[PDB]
Amino acid sequence: LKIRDAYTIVTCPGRNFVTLKIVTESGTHGIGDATLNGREMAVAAYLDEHVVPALIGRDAGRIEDTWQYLYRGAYWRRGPVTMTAIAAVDMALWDIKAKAAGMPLYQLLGGKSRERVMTYAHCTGQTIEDCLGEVARHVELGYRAVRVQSGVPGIETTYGVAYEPADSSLPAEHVWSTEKYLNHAPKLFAAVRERFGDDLHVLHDVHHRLTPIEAARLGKAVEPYHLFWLEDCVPAENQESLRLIREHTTTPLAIGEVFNSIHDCRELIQNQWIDYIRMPLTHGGGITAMRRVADLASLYHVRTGFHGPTDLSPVCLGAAIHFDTWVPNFGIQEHMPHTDETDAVFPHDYRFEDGHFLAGESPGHGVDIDEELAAKYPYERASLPVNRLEDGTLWHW
Amino acid sequence: LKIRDAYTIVTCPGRNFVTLKIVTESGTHGIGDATLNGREMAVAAYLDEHVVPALIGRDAGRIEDTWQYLYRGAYWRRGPVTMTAIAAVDMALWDIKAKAAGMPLYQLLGGKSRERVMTYAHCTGQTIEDCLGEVARHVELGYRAVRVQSGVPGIETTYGVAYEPADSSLPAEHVWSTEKYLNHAPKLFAAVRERFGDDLHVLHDVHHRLTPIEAARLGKAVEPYHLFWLEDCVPAENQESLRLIREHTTTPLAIGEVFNSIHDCRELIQNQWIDYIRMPLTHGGGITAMRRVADLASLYHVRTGFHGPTDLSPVCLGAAIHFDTWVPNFGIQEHMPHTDETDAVFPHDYRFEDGHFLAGESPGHGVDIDEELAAKYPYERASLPVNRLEDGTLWHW
Ligand SMILES: O=C(O)[C@H](O)[C@@H](O)[C@H](O)[C@H](O)CO
Ligand SMILES: O=C(O)[C@H](O)[C@@H](O)[C@H](O)[C@H](O)CO
Ligand SMILES: [Mg+2]
Ligand SMILES: [Mg+2]
């Protein structure tokens, strides 16, 4: 019942992961993802020094109380380090509760709303032709949906083209030209449609680099290609940033992988400025908070599109697949396969087949951590890149 | 020119402080406050492991570029841990810049706008009588302004009454009744006015415990007592929370000590829902960011009221006083005196006289850190309390 022990595990089976483990007096345990790419040790310290000591002796079944205790109790509310710490606890407690209930997590949430969970794959290449080759191979793999990114002529490096974003100890320095990208990007989607037809879902990630009127122009330009979404058009700390885009294009819009709170997107949703909300479990306060975000989204026809990169661990992925299985307003689940070393450290029972995930049936979220294996891979610092304009201006990566 | 070294110092001369020191190749150095009460080691890790390595080799003079580099470069934007780390770097770089210019910091910002910086003192007591005794005592010390808090009959513990909030390793557990507080509080201000008259500035901190209509009720009830401000009426992640209060009372409102970004308060300011913005340098992204916040506030007659508790170090206080000396739309500066041990660890040249601060004249922000002395006071974990309603509901402390 009560929490006997709680501790973090930091491991680098291909890239860094931070995991919270919670053990009850009865011996049942649960785990939560706590990985915050490029800032990992900040969450590890938040948990180790400040949260973990407060968890000892608490009733593990008190999920809601623990969430509020950590969210309100921190005094300094919201934020990526804060909410990732809270998310790790929350995921671990839901894991415990589902185990206690003898049910897979999706059953505890209200049962399945779908028989499988559609994903998309990253297709990338230096030239449009290179990208098209990748689309072909993934379609052969059974993917119904692909994200397409390709190099921009006249730009040395562009987002999503070589791919492990955090591939340097210190931030790599990329250079950017918005105008060259705006002129080129539509050619990628035209080429994809010409070769692969209309049935395929095609996604694109603008990755924060445009101003709103620039994103409006781009949305308009890509209307003929019927994208599944155009993602992260503009930095959105000021939520009104989406308004001009929405008023000028019918290309569907996705945002929110960089968010950690319903307060980051309440207006985006209520004003109907987006079609997909991307904030995932480990950065968005866990199951407890994301259920609330998804529900708000549902009132406005907005669907979930969980961020699912390699820098969220299989713990997040398994939990996410359970959530995806239940949530009425599911949109899509992003999939970037983990390394074999990562998969082995995090035994799990979710399955991928024919372009879709199937939720596990084991009690809990179905993921565990092999601590002794984890210990074979010590932490290695790795930072996300920064992006600069051609004049040296520090821009948005 | 270039940064050759950067590191944190953690010390507990009466309570925990975290400081960042940056040193250049010419041997000049600056320091910045990085203290985040009750979550101190999360910021320490954020700086040590992720920020400090990226500072080495950077041009010390590039304050703006460094701020953007850390702010945008982090990818996960905003948050108390994030923005405190950024603030610490920013403060240290401004310290260096001022030293390089051979000027006290206020000169660098645009020079002096006032001859002294008005403060307010905390006056607290179990009963109203106890509090009134403390007001008299502080008026004797020359304070022109006092915050008043007193116990609520029928409630064991209330905010600001016995005072160091973080007085426990793990969070102390307080019990709360809104209804008893609402009936009682107006009696305190009535008594202050009866004994001390009209000329004294009287402030009160609601400390997050009310709903909007409750705070509207309170604001109206205390109008006859003409408070300088009513602070932190309601949790304000949803900034619209202030609207009903502002529509129902003319008691001036203050908010923001728990904010870390202009995006936490842009709407509060533009809609004229507040009179004072309380976000301080060390939690609000430093001088660079707070200049922008203050300037935004100025367009709407909003004034600065920096949070100034013991849990922001003399480094923040010195920098704050410099800032207060320049900023046109200065309102007031909170003052909770630090312990002698703290003042010793952080030698400084700002002065307190007759209820006001006088800015230092030494180049830099005028504060330094005695690292040898700091080493004599090891970190001691201390958490902020939580607040529960009478039925056990985890509430806002
Ligand atoms: O849509 C996505 O998958 C994201 O943009 C990732 O590529 C992020 O850049 C990375 O997860 C940050 O750590
Ligand atoms: O107005 C104030 O001085 C604040 O409310 C402080 O009392 C905070 O509670 C404390 O600084 C949290 O660390
Ligand atoms: Mg993305
Ligand atoms: Mg306060």
Inter-residue contact B153 to B184 (CB < 8 Å):
yes
Please tell me whether residues B310 and B374 are part of one structural domain: no
Q: Which residue has the least CA distance to atom 11 on ligand 2?
A: B309
Inter-residue contact B45 to B53 (CB < 8 Å):
no
CB count within 10 Å of CB B115 equals: 9
Please tell me whether residues B143 and B78 are part of one structural domain: no
| B314 closest CA partner among B121, B91, B110 | B91
Q: What angle do CA B149, B245, B123 make, to 5 degrees?
A: 10
Q: What angle do CA B189, B233, B259 make, to 5 degrees?
A: 130
Exposed / middle / buried, residue A14 (Cβ in 10 Å: 0-12, 13-18, 19+)? middle
Inter-residue contact A245 to A233 (CB < 8 Å):
yes
Please tell me whether residues B146 and B199 are part of one structural domain: yes
Residues with CB under 6 A from ligand 2: A 75; B 37, 165, 205, 207, 257, 307, 309, 311, 334, 384
Q: Which residues contact B357 (CB under 8 A, 6 or more apart)?
A: B116, B117, B119, B321, B324, B333, B335, B350, B351
Q: Which residues contact A381 (CB under 8 A, 6 or more apart)?
A: A169, B49, B50, B53
* A240 vs B: CB within 8 A: no
**Residue B261 parent element (H or E):** none
Whether ligand 1 lies within 6 angstroms of the CB of A280 is answered as no
Please tell me whether residues B179 and B325 are part of one structural domain: yes
- 8-state DSSP, B152: -
Please tell me whether residues A211 and A63 are part of one structural domain: no
Q: Which residue has the least CA distance to atom 1 on ligand 1?
A: A307
**How many structural domains comprise chain A?**
2
Please tell me whether residues A282 and A367 are part of one structural domain: no
* Cβ pair B53:A169 closer than 8 A: yes
Ligand 1 midpoint to CA B59 (Å): 29
Helix, strand and coil percent figures for chain B, each rounded to 5: 40, 20, 40
Please tell me whether residues B84 and B200 are part of one structural domain: no
Enumerate residues 44 to 73 of chain A having a beta carbon within 8 A of any beta carbon in chain B.
Answer: 44-46, 48-50, 53-54, 65, 68-69, 72-73
Using DSSP's 3-state secondary structure scheme, residue B147 falls into strand
Technique used to solve these coordinates: X-ray
* Cβ pair A260:B79 closer than 8 A: yes
Cα-Cα-Cα-Cα dihedral sign, residues B197, B199, B205, B209: positive
Inter-residue contact A88 to A148 (CB < 8 Å):
no
Please tell me whether residues A350 and A369 are part of one structural domain: no
**Resolution rounded to one decimal, in angstroms:** 1.5
Enumerate residues 244 to 303 of chain B having a beta carbon within 8 A of any beta carbon in chain A.
Answer: 258, 260-261, 263, 266, 283
Ligand 3 midpoint to CA A206 (Å): 8
Structure tokens given for A292: 């609330």
Instruction: Tell me how far CA of residue B123 lies from CA of B139, B177, B269, B326, in angstroms.
Output: 10, 22, 29, 28
Range of the domain at B182: 105-361
Q: How many CA atoms lie within 13 A of B291 on its CB side?
A: 17
Whether ligand 1 lies within 6 angstroms of the CB of A19 is answered as no
Beta strand B117-125 with B356-358 is antiparallel
* Cβ pair B81:A46 closer than 8 A: yes
Spell out which residues of chain A touch residue B258, defining contact as CB-CB under 8 Å: 75-77
User: How far, in Å, CA of A96 to CA of A286, rounded?
Assistant: 14
Structure tokens given for B44: 């320490």
User: How far, in Å, CA of B261 to CA of A103, rounded?
Assistant: 42
CB count within 10 Å of CB A53 equals: 14
Structure tokens given for A380: 């290695």
* CATH at residue B268: 3.20.20.120
Counted residue by residue, chain A has a size of 397
* Cβ pair B38:A45 closer than 8 A: no
Residues of B at the annotated binding site for substrate? 37, 122, 257, 278, 307, 311, 334
* B391 vs A: CB within 8 A: no
Is A122 annotated to bind ligand? yes
Please tell me whether residues A245 and A338 are part of one structural domain: yes
* CATH at residue A71: 3.30.390.10
Please tell me whether residues A353 and A391 are part of one structural domain: no
Spell out which residues of chain B touch residue A263, defining contact as CB-CB under 8 Å: 237-238
Spell out which residues of chain A touch residue B397, defining contact as CB-CB under 8 Å: 72-73, 75
Please tell me whether residues B200 and B76 are part of one structural domain: no
Please tell me whether residues A189 and A296 are part of one structural domain: yes
Q: Is A69 an active-site residue?
A: no
The number of the ligand nearest the C-alpha atom of A159 reads 1
Q: Which residues contact B13 (CB under 8 A, 6 or more apart)?
A: B339, B341, B342, B344, B345, B373, B374, B377
* Cβ pair A41:B41 closer than 8 A: no
Burial B367-390 (b: 16+ CB within 10 A, else e): bbbeeeebeebeeebbbbbbbbee
Instruction: Tell me how far CA of residue A367 lies from CA of A70, A318, A372, B142, B330, in angstroms.
Output: 24, 6, 16, 63, 54
* Cβ pair A383:B54 closer than 8 A: yes
Phi, psi torsion values for A354, nearest 5 degrees: 50, 45
> N- to C-terminal Cα distance for chain A?
45
